Design a binder for this molecule. Sequence first.
Ligand SMILES: NC(=O)C1=CN([C@@H]2O[C@H](COP(=O)(O)OP(=O)(O)OC[C@H]3O[C@@H](n4cnc5c(N)ncnc54)[C@H](O)[C@@H]3O)[C@@H](O)[C@H]2O)C=CC1
Lengths: 959, 77, 76, 71
Amino acid sequence: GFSLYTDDTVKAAAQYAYDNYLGKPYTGSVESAPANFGGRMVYRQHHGLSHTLRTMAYAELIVEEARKAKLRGETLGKFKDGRTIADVTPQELKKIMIAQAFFVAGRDDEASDAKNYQKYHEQSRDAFLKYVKDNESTLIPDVFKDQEDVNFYARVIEDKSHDWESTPAHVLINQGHMVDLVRVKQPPESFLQRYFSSMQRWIGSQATEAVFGIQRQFFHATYEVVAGFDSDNKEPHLVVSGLGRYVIGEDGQPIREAPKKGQKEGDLKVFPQTYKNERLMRVDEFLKLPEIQNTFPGSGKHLQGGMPGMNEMDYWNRLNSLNRARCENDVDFCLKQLQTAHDKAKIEPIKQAFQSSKGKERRQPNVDEIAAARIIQQILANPDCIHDDHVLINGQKLEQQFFRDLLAKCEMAVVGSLLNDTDIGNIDTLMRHEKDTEFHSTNPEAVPVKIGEYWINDQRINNSSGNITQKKHDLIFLMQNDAWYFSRVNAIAQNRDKGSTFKEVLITTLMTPLTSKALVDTSQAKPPTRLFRGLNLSEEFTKGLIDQANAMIANTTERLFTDHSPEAFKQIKLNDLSKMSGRTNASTTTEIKLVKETWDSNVIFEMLDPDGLLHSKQVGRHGEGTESEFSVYLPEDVALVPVKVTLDGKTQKGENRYVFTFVAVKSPDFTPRHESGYAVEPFLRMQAAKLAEVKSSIEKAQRAPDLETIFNLQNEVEAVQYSHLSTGYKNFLKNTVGPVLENSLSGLMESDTDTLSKALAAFPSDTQWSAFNFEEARQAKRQMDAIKQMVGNKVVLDALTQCQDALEKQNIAGALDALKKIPSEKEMGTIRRELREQIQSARQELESLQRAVVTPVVTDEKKVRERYDALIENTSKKITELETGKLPNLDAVKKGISNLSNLKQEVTVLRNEKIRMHVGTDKVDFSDVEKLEQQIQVIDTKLADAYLLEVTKQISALE
Amino acid sequence: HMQIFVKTLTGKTITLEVEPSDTIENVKAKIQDKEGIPPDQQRLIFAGKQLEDGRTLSDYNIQKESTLHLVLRLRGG
Amino acid sequence: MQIFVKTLTGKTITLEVEPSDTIENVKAKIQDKEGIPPDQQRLIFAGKQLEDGRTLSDYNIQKESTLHLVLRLRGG
Amino acid sequence: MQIFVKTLTGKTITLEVEPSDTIENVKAKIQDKEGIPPDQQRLIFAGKQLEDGRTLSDYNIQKESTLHLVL
Ligand SMILES: NC(=O)C1=CN([C@@H]2O[C@H](COP(=O)(O)OP(=O)(O)OC[C@H]3O[C@@H](n4cnc5c(N)ncnc54)[C@H](O)[C@@H]3O)[C@@H](O)[C@H]2O)C=CC1
């Protein structure tokens, strides 16, 4: 619970050091001039408040990264006793920081020679002692243990002896001070390589890169210069071991001297020297050195300096401005600035781990969710189809597991949008048709509730008006409270329920999207940035959550040079806790007091939501003593990635309370891979059955295909040539009507063809017929109309078949083509208003084609691809390293089995990333994770054999 | 005796009972008794072919249950 | 017997009640004290929800214990 | 000497030999008793695995002792 950024005791000590020493003018001679920034004064710009403040953050930082490192398999440098930087405690870190505040208080000048050095640090240790002396009544009891303790840290501020490696307290305070010099000294490569190697010895290589990484962000947050790192820097390298240099003379070779059994040996740090012929070694020459390339990550790398997004002119402005002064003067502001920067460096590394998002928006329906919402809609519309253990629609039997699959694979927030107020109103009709019993989630000794009877009577008394808007609130209200409902709905939704009836699974599948829709329409409140959620769980099951949470926090680190993204990706894909708040309308509050106090929660999910993703809707009315509740249906590409895991006191039942703080992160890497067809394929068979009835009825209601009636109208056409009728009428039948009956005869007689479809279009309209006055043309039309309904009846019958043929083999695209064949009206209006049942179907497929296939390799084919190569290379290098493992005793073998246990998990991640980044219709190439899996089975039996050997050698020994 | 069918553009079918060998002129008179149409104003059409009064039904290969198309020719016999 | 019911607001209320009695009656006692309708309030104890109709004896409520009252009203 | 060779499996077996033995002969000797192949047998006694070339007289193995042989 301790932190530099939120401890008034630590900040008070800082305020003191500022008011008295750091904030007072430099009474020294050398470089003690006052600095101006934006029209505000800062007496000590180099070693002022911003200086001693950052250094404290470093301690916080280095200890965090150190503790993260140990959470990985890493072994940190031990001191005289078996303690590492990661063994530093919250109390000890407070002493370190308070000590660290006065570490530059004794400064009078900016002078840098040994005499001034001893003097100023002489004064600094006193200032500390003085401050402690003043507030001994509040510190020495609890903050410190005794005067011995205070003298230890005061001794360190003095630095009489030159040791800085002695203990954690010593290393932190000294490195923290020296690393803050990165923002000033001018061979950035030379210094950085130096400071890196220094910290790498105590904390680790990855942990260090995180440090200087988050260190650049502290500079930007405190308005100090962020230097770059140019691998190709051609300026003269400066050896930091003193102020020496490296030299190359005659032959382009660096000067050396060779001792015993070393071949060529270390470089002669020619101090600064005057030469020739001879030339000093450049930064790039140093960086390309075989010594440096294999030990320093920054070789060949480049870090852009200044600020990204602004030129160096407008950067200079940002450096010489008020906040640069407010930082050096305002202690509260400076802490906040770092605080947010540090807290930021905990999120951004997670974003970098996965491929980028775009907008916060919820996704768009795919085929299955479109068809899904159709089914739900009809169920609410026609409750009659609901049975004891299944729902029947258009001859399709929808079992239990289907509605479970519908809850598992369908973005229910998205299905809810496809529903309407009419579908809300069908809750009343749905609840009338039902008089079944909902049960409690656990609490087997609980009163069952008739859900149908409860709803109806709920609306009679509370919804006197029947107002549709209200209904939604009532549905939402039914959601909160009534643990005879939400207990079963949530337990079913997340597939962690037991002994559930079909009526309970069915209604959950329906009430979920409806409730979500009700929430979306209702909530007009601004989306909160911070939500809290409480759960009751066993201390041992919570123990497993803390480990999974610690895995992700441990392997996600800010970047400097080398990219540790793939590994963070892996660890998060392995321990992810997001699917605990998904698949259902999880309820949350905005006020902590409701989870801590009222409900006495042992586990609290603090969910940070600054980017506004995770759209959460208000529930009930908020106020003083209200729940202040918000529902959240977790989006399928949004994950809740843990940033911190804190212990906060205990509950009423004595057990410790853990508060996990998560952070919403949207990325296509989180979208679940679901095989489509789970809700649409039944829906296609449904529509095919609906057409089968319309086809059958039409096939026997109007029928028969008299061929003779065509022959006559063909004989009559040739017969009206000698009729003394019009000159045009004789031409209309011979030239216009003649050929139509020509093709109509070929089509009907010879198979189907598009001939029947095209001929049906050549049929003269009623308008063309009327323009032949009134006469024996009327007797011609009713003959013609009789013939049209013959061709039409056939084409409409072949279209229903060829369409039904589609649906059988899916091809929802091909089905619609046929239905575009059916004639409309004046071409075909001899079939009754089952035209309605037919247009209703083309309308069902018009909407199924409005599918959106959302992408998972949404760009960053380079990130997705590159990231994969790192993982497989890593995992393969972990398996081959275990491949030739010395198994001396039983301990080495025990370590190997758990290794293999973890590698087994890794390779499947390798597998899914192959699947998820693969495109096309062909065999997914697994050739590489095959060679790995085989290695696994090899070192599975190797250990299992060598295990029994050791367990036997152990019982042998014990006798 | 065989029965054949005669149609009009107006829309009425006429049924006639006749034996083969009868002439077209003879069939025209049979229409006269049935539907009061003068033989002078008749054109018989079959299979796109116009029947002359001298030839029998057997010549045009008209057979039982066949259909004919009667048209009224005015200003001519 | 004496019991305590607390609120998210931050104020504690003191109640005089019998171990006999239902919860709706205890809910009513809170209603009279601070003018809050029993329909809008849910009583919680040890993170567990107390149902009306059930006596304090059923939940094993004892003297000087504390309860947690929260306001759950309908949407509107 | 009388010796016993056991396995973790849960069966105790009694084998008869007196002195001098080396692993090369002992590998064959286990073979004879229960018609079980000695392609790769690891010797267990006093928590240590017996290597071929050293005699049974070496390691000071004695009568009525129990061994735990596993392959
Ligand atoms: N849960 C909360 O923090 C808040 C709850 N509320 C209200 O309280 C009522 C209930 O909310 P919930 O307690 O969440 O009911 P719920 O059933 O949604 O979840 C509650 C219980 O599920 C149990 N559970 C078991 N396995 C689980 C798993 N794998 N994932 C998640 N939970 C698991 C947990 O013990 C938890 O107590 C509602 O009226 C709601 O309006 C209001 C604000 C916050």
